[PDB]
Design an enzyme around this catalytic site. Sequence first.
Site, PDB file in Angstrom:
ATOM      1  N   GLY A 177      46.964  38.464  35.130  1.00 21.14           N
ATOM      2  CA  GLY A 177      48.390  38.325  35.427  1.00 21.14           C
ATOM      3  C   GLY A 177      48.657  37.717  36.792  1.00 21.14           C
ATOM      4  O   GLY A 177      47.907  36.855  37.249  1.00 21.14           O
ATOM      5  N   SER A 219      40.391  37.658  34.593  1.00 19.28           N
ATOM      6  CA  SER A 219      41.066  37.116  35.773  1.00 19.28           C
ATOM      7  C   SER A 219      41.261  38.198  36.853  1.00 19.28           C
ATOM      8  O   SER A 219      40.270  38.766  37.317  1.00 19.28           O
ATOM      9  CB  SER A 219      42.370  36.426  35.361  1.00 19.28           C
ATOM     10  OG  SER A 219      42.126  35.465  34.355  1.00 19.28           O
ATOM     11  N   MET A 220      42.502  38.510  37.231  1.00 20.28           N
ATOM     12  CA  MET A 220      42.759  39.534  38.252  1.00 20.28           C
ATOM     13  C   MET A 220      42.258  40.925  37.856  1.00 20.28           C
ATOM     14  O   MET A 220      41.932  41.721  38.730  1.00 20.28           O
ATOM     15  CB  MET A 220      44.251  39.601  38.610  1.00 20.28           C
ATOM     16  CG  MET A 220      44.804  38.357  39.297  1.00 20.28           C
ATOM     17  SD  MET A 220      43.888  37.801  40.747  1.00 20.28           S
ATOM     18  CE  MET A 220      44.107  39.176  41.868  1.00 20.28           C
ATOM     19  N   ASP A 225      35.344  28.319  31.736  1.00 20.02           N
ATOM     20  CA  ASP A 225      36.131  29.136  30.820  1.00 20.02           C
ATOM     21  C   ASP A 225      35.183  29.856  29.861  1.00 20.02           C
ATOM     22  O   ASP A 225      34.805  29.321  28.817  1.00 20.02           O
ATOM     23  CB  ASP A 225      37.142  28.266  30.064  1.00 20.02           C
ATOM     24  CG  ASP A 225      38.222  29.075  29.355  1.00 20.02           C
ATOM     25  OD1 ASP A 225      38.073  30.306  29.178  1.00 20.02           O
ATOM     26  OD2 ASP A 225      39.235  28.459  28.959  1.00 20.02           O
TER      27      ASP A 225
END
Lengths: 161, 164, 164, 162, 162, 161, 163, 161, 161, 161
Positions: H50, H79-80, H139
């Site tokens: 996010g 991610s985060m 990715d």
Amino acid sequence: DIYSRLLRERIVCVMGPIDDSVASLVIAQLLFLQSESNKKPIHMYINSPGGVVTAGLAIYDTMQYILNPICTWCVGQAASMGSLLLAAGTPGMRHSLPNSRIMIHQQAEEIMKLKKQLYNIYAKHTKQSLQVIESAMERDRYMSPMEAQEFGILDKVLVHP
Amino acid sequence: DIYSRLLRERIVCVMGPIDDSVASLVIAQLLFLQSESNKKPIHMYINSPGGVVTAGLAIYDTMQYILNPICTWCVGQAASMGSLLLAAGTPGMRHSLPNSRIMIHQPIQAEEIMKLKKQLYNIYAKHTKQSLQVIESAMERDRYMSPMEAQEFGILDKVLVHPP
Amino acid sequence: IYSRLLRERIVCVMGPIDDSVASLVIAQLLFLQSESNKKPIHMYINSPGGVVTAGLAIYDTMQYILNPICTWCVGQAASMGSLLLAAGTPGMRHSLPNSRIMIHQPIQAEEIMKLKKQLYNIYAKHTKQSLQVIESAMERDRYMSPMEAQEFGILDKVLVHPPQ
Amino acid sequence: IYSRLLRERIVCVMGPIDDSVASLVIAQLLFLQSESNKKPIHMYINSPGGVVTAGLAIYDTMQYILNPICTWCVGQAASMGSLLLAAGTPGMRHSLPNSRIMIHQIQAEEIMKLKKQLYNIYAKHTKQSLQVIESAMERDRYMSPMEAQEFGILDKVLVHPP
Amino acid sequence: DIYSRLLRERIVCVMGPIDDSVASLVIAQLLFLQSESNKKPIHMYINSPGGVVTAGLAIYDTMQYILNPICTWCVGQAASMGSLLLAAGTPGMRHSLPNSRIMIHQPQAEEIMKLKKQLYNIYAKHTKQSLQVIESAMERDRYMSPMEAQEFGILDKVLVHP
Amino acid sequence: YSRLLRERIVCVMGPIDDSVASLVIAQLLFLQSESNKKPIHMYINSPGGVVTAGLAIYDTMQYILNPICTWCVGQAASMGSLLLAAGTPGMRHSLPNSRIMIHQPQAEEIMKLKKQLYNIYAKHTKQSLQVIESAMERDRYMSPMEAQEFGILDKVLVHPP
Amino acid sequence: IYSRLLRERIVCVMGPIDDSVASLVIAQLLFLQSESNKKPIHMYINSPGGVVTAGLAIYDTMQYILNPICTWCVGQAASMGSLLLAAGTPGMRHSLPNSRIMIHQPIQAEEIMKLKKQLYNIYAKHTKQSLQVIESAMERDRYMSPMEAQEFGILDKVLVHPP
Amino acid sequence: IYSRLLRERIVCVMGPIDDSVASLVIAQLLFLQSESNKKPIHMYINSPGGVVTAGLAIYDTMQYILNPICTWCVGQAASMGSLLLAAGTPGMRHSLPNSRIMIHQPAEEIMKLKKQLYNIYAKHTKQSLQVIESAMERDRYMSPMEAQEFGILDKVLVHPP
Amino acid sequence: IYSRLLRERIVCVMGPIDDSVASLVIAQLLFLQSESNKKPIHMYINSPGGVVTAGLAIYDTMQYILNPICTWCVGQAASMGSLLLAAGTPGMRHSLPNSRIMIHQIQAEEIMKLKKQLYNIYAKHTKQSLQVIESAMERDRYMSPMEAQEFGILDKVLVHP
Amino acid sequence: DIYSRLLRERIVCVMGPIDDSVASLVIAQLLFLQSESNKKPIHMYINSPGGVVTAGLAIYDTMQYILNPICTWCVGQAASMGSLLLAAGTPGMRHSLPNSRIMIHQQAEEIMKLKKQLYNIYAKHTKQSLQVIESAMERDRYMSPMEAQEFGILDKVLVHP
Ligand SMILES: CC[C@H](C)[C@H]1C(=O)N(Cc2ccc(OC)c3ccccc23)C[C@@H]2N(C(=O)NCc3ccc(Br)cc3)CCC(=O)N12
Ligand SMILES: CC[C@H](C)[C@H]1C(=O)N(Cc2ccc(OC)c3ccccc23)C[C@@H]2N(C(=O)NCc3ccc(Br)cc3)CCC(=O)N12
Ligand SMILES: CC[C@H](C)[C@H]1C(=O)N(Cc2ccc(OC)c3ccccc23)C[C@@H]2N(C(=O)NCc3ccc(Br)cc3)CCC(=O)N12
Ligand SMILES: CC[C@H](C)[C@H]1C(=O)N(Cc2ccc(OC)c3ccccc23)C[C@@H]2N(C(=O)NCc3ccc(Br)cc3)CCC(=O)N12
Ligand SMILES: CC[C@H](C)[C@H]1C(=O)N(Cc2ccc(OC)c3ccccc23)C[C@@H]2N(C(=O)NCc3ccc(Br)cc3)CCC(=O)N12
Ligand SMILES: CC[C@H](C)[C@H]1C(=O)N(Cc2ccc(OC)c3ccccc23)C[C@@H]2N(C(=O)NCc3ccc(Br)cc3)CCC(=O)N12
Ligand SMILES: CC[C@H](C)[C@H]1C(=O)N(Cc2ccc(OC)c3ccccc23)C[C@@H]2N(C(=O)NCc3ccc(Br)cc3)CCC(=O)N12
Ligand SMILES: CC[C@H](C)[C@H]1C(=O)N(Cc2ccc(OC)c3ccccc23)C[C@@H]2N(C(=O)NCc3ccc(Br)cc3)CCC(=O)N12
Ligand SMILES: CC[C@H](C)[C@H]1C(=O)N(Cc2ccc(OC)c3ccccc23)C[C@@H]2N(C(=O)NCc3ccc(Br)cc3)CCC(=O)N12
Ligand SMILES: CC[C@H](C)[C@H]1C(=O)N(Cc2ccc(OC)c3ccccc23)C[C@@H]2N(C(=O)NCc3ccc(Br)cc3)CCC(=O)N12
């Protein structure tokens, strides 16, 4: 029979938000005008808040790719990618009307690569340093036509022809 | 119409997101130009962020099927399936203008998404002239290439500021 | 461009099949049959499938007209799209190399089953596979390559370039 | 191409039937009558049915014009579509082999009054009694082209032309 | 194209919900056909659930204003203001096909009452029914058959064929 | 539903997403602390849903000590059937009219996740990876007795024994 | 009011039956199971039907609990609603006089038929009608009066007031 | 249920991270610190990532409070989410067996934030800035064992020891 | 305020009648009977009507319970609202002075089967003939309370108690 | 709520657009206050642009039905059905604050029959003739409190107690 009439005067319009659709039309018109004559000047009317960077670069690259002299004319405004196209007209042929407003302000690695491409283009056409271009592009402000002329975005501020 | 005038000049446009309607239109125009002349070059303008894989593969197969030399021209960008079409131009006739961005990264059932992806690896390897191992590794990287990087990679043949 | 295609005996089955798409395709097939009941008609198929009765409407019209029908799968032929592909004149059913073919399928309970049995009978006929093999295969959620579709009997020829 | 279809005496009853579709079909039926009131008109029917009064408007026009009308069921003829299919000239009501046909379908009195008009129309054109029409229209099911032929909804099931 | 082709044959179409745009279009077509010939009949196709009262009255007044005989033809339905227009055709020239449905019922307060009184007077005049019979009838939420509409005085002829 | 949690009953209802999984996961941990020996009853009436959310519930079921009785009522499709199969051996249940489906409705990642599903199904059903892979390709439901034979569940019952 | 209804052993199957409605009814049925194995549960059915698997979830839970279940059709029981009505304990299936009952029913091709055949088996079991009778009856798009549903085997008692 | 869960010194970072999720998590971390600055805090992470500043807000708070923080990857940490997972106290960073971990993020400011992420990952994983940079460009997801060898987590657990 | 009304043996049929309104009204009618099967229940009716089967559900429940039911029309009782008004215990059907009452109002057969049920209920409770009921229900109009009293829909029009 | 505290002070609020739900609550509150004391005055706060006629008539009829004195207070505005409720307070007890605005301006036979009911009610409470009420109700205008006093809609215009 109004914008096609405009095309018969070798006038191309960059109006409103620049996106891939707008760019592709302008590009086709520039190629059309080159086939009609690779010598005769083309007038580029710019009244734009800017828009998509790669679409703006599509137009920019095409302007350089064609042989023709390109006279740019800032009417209303040339902001962001609009000002890049204004600056990309043939040297000595970059114009503004008196009340126009000009703005050069706009993955993480990609947007920075595109930013440096814009710095390099502005440096080529304005003769300002990359250091100054970068600083100027941070500043959320518009320039007057005289300021833009001093900066090197344009050559002539015209009240009448 | 100016896009009808483009078709008269043997110019076809692949612009914006690629879907079935874009593909079937581009496919139809390619056959038309082959009927007028099976020898004369066709110019393919590519300014696209990519799109539906099967629609891009439809254009790809049609490009290989017709007899004509196809000059591909990257202006603005050719991302994902757009860069595949760019790379699938006739050898020696794959072009970009100087400020274009090129992406080979790719941003139904599990088996099917992989089967399609493996088809993309085969196509990119064939047309770049690089090993499939290099292609598969490179396609994981979420990044764009400059025209000179794309030339180095074998996606294109020429980076042109103006005609020669 | 699609009107100009129609002058060359090409009909396009593109995108989701519904009643409107079907009626246009049908109208075009009758047009071409009136101009000549002998000369081949080319059916371009790039479709994810669609409405079963609308697909059956096109199927029946293909069988009803006298003409040879060359089917060409580019991009994909899924669900009713693959039925139409398989319904081309024997020996004249084609795919390009990277197309994907699916016979799997994505009113009252008895009616859905009646329609499904009609699909089995059509696939069994044109592919020559048994009703049990068709029924078992249509249960499997997967695509086939053109060579697999050839082996199965959905099509006759996988072409990279034209023969002549 | 729908213009050229009309030039070939083909009228299309396609998709949901409403007042706009009906009045177009009706206008086209009068056009073809003026061009020739003796030459056959072909009615292509691929419809799930629709608005009853719109369908009855088409039906009444079919009977009103003097032309023989060949009906052709391709894809499907459900609800009011099957009424129009049945309303073709005797001997000239057709289906292709994979079509599906269904005869199953304001104030409460009006809906029932409209329903009785449908019963009389089906009974007339199918040659079936009012009871067997009523009883059959209650059953939520489709008929095959041969079943519809046996019922009196159509005359010929054709794989190819004669 | 087909509706302009209809207009060449002196046929005007009142289709669907009657609003100001439909009325103004129909009104323009009536004046056109009058200038072409002020004696030759105009045919008015009516397939409509009704609509805006002032729009229907605009059409009605124009029908009376022009010199031409107007044949009204009810196909599908003529409800609310559509039945008023049907009834406003020239005496002897008001027609319906056999399965049409006709409704005279209507589905500031003083103003809606003033309009209603205008509708009563218009229906009374063209049907030759009394104001009290018209009032009582328009309160009843029901449709009439073409034969019922004929005996009420809304139309003259119910035709299966010409 | 809060009163059900007092009876050691957890509900996997409807589409499975991160929010559904997080609630179920917290309820599972709550019931472990009250008694890590007492059985937990998992009600499953679900068309499936998000694969990682499904794997989050699965992992938590294996992580806690408790015997978990799974109960298929209505349906257990896709990740729902995986959760059904992941109940303690001998304690996986369906009512008579339930429907069970093991079929599922970057490219490498979806294959990696699919391989994880194959390994979980093969573990809890005692079927080979080939049998699981072939079966998951078939778009069909199984009856409770078919599911029982396949190794998805242990008991098909009309009443409590 | 609905929690107060639950104290009186009254479960309400109201409106369109989906997974949320079914799981509430199912959970409520298990609450009343734990209060008493023997005491009758009252099932209020006013429903146009709904999702087939959700209806079967309720049905299976009704059969699974040991309690006698009184079914009460008020307003209507259509589609899966009528199945649940018919699934009440023999002798204890009720309708009020103006209710309407419909057994007609207004995923893959094989599955819809598998589900439909399950519905035929349930109706045949509880009504004591043959499969062939249930089949042809479920094709007819119509409602039954409470009396007509009574003679068909869907319910036992049509009552105006209590006895 | 989540309120009762807080009594056990458990905080949940669930779903997409935004300012509201961060502020709730941050407030819960301060609560648990005032109840006991010595006792461990268990951080459940099931998130696709996010908003970067919201993630950094959580990250900074985790470093600010005195407590040991056990991180628990269930479902996914992308991610985060993976940064927060990696930011747990050394030796106390956990994943369940079927979780998936991603450090990949799916003009001048975004570059500065990107460098801040590289510095945070390098610190907590013990990988070089170049290894982090190259990895975040790709990715792909890591299995729990891959994340362990990379330095994002310490223990891949099937059950408690 | 609404539970306060319920303690006074007042049930409210407010606004459009649907299954949700009916089931609440029906539940309240059972509650009041269990409290006392002989004490009157007051039914406030201010409704434009609604779903026919939902109205018949309320009607049947009124007839099923043993209690006297006082109906009270205030604002309006239209369509199914007026049937419920008419279905109050004889002698106990009321309207306030300015209320408006309207008796004017699936397959074609079913809608007609339901209309016949309405005709017979109105016939029963108003004591009007079927001719009068069927003819009156065709007329799109409202009755005053005195007209409705005269018709047999209600017993008393009262300005005050 | 503070509106519950108002109810203990025998204040009822007719606020915003009048519909069936607003009216039904106002009506329930009027019955409550009467049962607490059938002689103590009730204060009706009216700040309303009007609304649904039959809902306004429901409140009007209930006001007349209960035994209590009703003080009406116009603050902000009483337009359309609001002004009818204002005028319907007990004679001598109809009030407005100084800057309020009052407006009596608002099938075919049925809306006209409703309109006649309104004329009769306004005539009764204002003591104006029926033709005056008819005429006045056509006039699209607001009245000041003093004009409303002169008309007969209210009795007292109060700046303070
Ligand atoms: C200076 C043009 C070149 C000499 C050359 C060329 O490189 N192109 C590729 C090209 C295609 C499409 C593009 O954006 C739509 C391009 C954009 C930027 C750069 C190249 C693009 C096609 C062009 N044509 C050409 O210019 N016709 C004349 C013409 C074009 C358009 C119209 Br409308 C009418 C006439 C064919 C023959 C021909 O030689 N050229
Ligand atoms: C190399 C083409 C072949 C010579 C051959 C052929 O295989 N097709 C099939 C075909 C149809 C439609 C498709 O996408 C719409 C196809 C796409 C890819 C491949 C095949 C496709 C039709 C084509 N035609 C043909 O070439 N017209 C000339 C023409 C086409 C379009 C237009 Br507009 C104008 C003229 C008829 C005669 C003829 O023999 N051919
Ligand atoms: C093989 C056609 C037959 C020889 C025959 C026939 O049975 N029809 C019925 C028919 C109509 C409409 C349909 O979908 C729109 C039909 C679809 C499927 C099957 C039949 C359909 C009319 C057709 N016509 C005909 O084909 N004109 C020639 C023509 C058609 C369309 C266009 Br555009 C241009 C010319 C008139 C003469 C004529 O005899 N026929
Ligand atoms: C057998 C036709 C009759 C002899 C007669 C007739 O009753 N009408 C009324 C009528 C109008 C519109 C309608 O739906 C749009 C009608 C629908 C159903 C029935 C009548 C309809 C006009 C028609 N005309 C006529 O047929 N034009 C020829 C024509 C029509 C349409 C087009 Br486009 C082109 C030419 C004028 C001469 C003429 O006398 N008639
Ligand atoms: C009986 C018509 C009269 C003889 C007279 C007349 O009073 N008008 C006013 C008028 C205008 C517009 C209206 O709705 C659009 C009207 C509607 C209802 C009534 C009057 C309307 C214009 C008309 N014209 C006239 O009739 N053109 C002929 C014409 C009209 C339309 C078209 Br398209 C083509 C030709 C000019 C000469 C002429 O003198 N008149
Ligand atoms: C076997 C449990 C372990 C002994 C251990 C543990 O590993 N966790 C981490 C963890 C946290 C959150 C999670 O999803 C929300 C987790 C999901 C899956 C796996 C771990 C999760 C917290 C748990 N606690 C614990 O379970 N309280 C008891 C309790 C839980 C919830 C409620 Br509400 C009430 C009491 C604290 C003490 C304690 O040491 N543990
Ligand atoms: C006859 C019930 C059985 C004896 C048994 C059982 O098989 N279950 C599984 C089960 C769980 C959830 C379900 O839908 C939500 C089920 C639906 C259908 C069938 C089984 C379901 C749990 C139930 N319990 C039980 O019934 N608590 C009592 C209770 C339930 C709800 C509430 Br609220 C309060 C108390 C716990 C232990 C216990 O003994 N049982
Ligand atoms: C380690 C905390 C420190 C000891 C100190 C502090 O620096 N703050 C500032 C601060 C505020 C808000 C923030 O996110 C909402 C902050 C986030 C990150 C960093 C600082 C934040 C207030 C905190 N308080 C405090 O923590 N009570 C305990 C407490 C907090 C929340 C709840 Br709910 C219950 C108890 C007051 C006393 C007190 O001295 N502190
Ligand atoms: C005259 C009632 C009967 C004496 C009997 C009965 O036949 N029912 C079935 C029934 C259930 C639900 C329904 O709509 C929600 C029904 C609607 C209409 C008709 C029946 C309905 C349950 C009722 N109960 C009963 O009397 N509770 C009292 C009560 C109800 C609700 C509330 Br809240 C509080 C107390 C249980 C025991 C009991 O014996 N009965
Ligand atoms: C003057 C009231 C009368 C004395 C009488 C009466 O005619 N009703 C009918 C009635 C019900 C509902 C209505 O709108 C919701 C009505 C609206 C307008 C007129 C009547 C309405 C019930 C009322 N009750 C009564 O008033 N409790 C006292 C009370 C009411 C509400 C609340 Br909250 C608390 C206490 C029972 C005893 C009792 O005898 N009455």
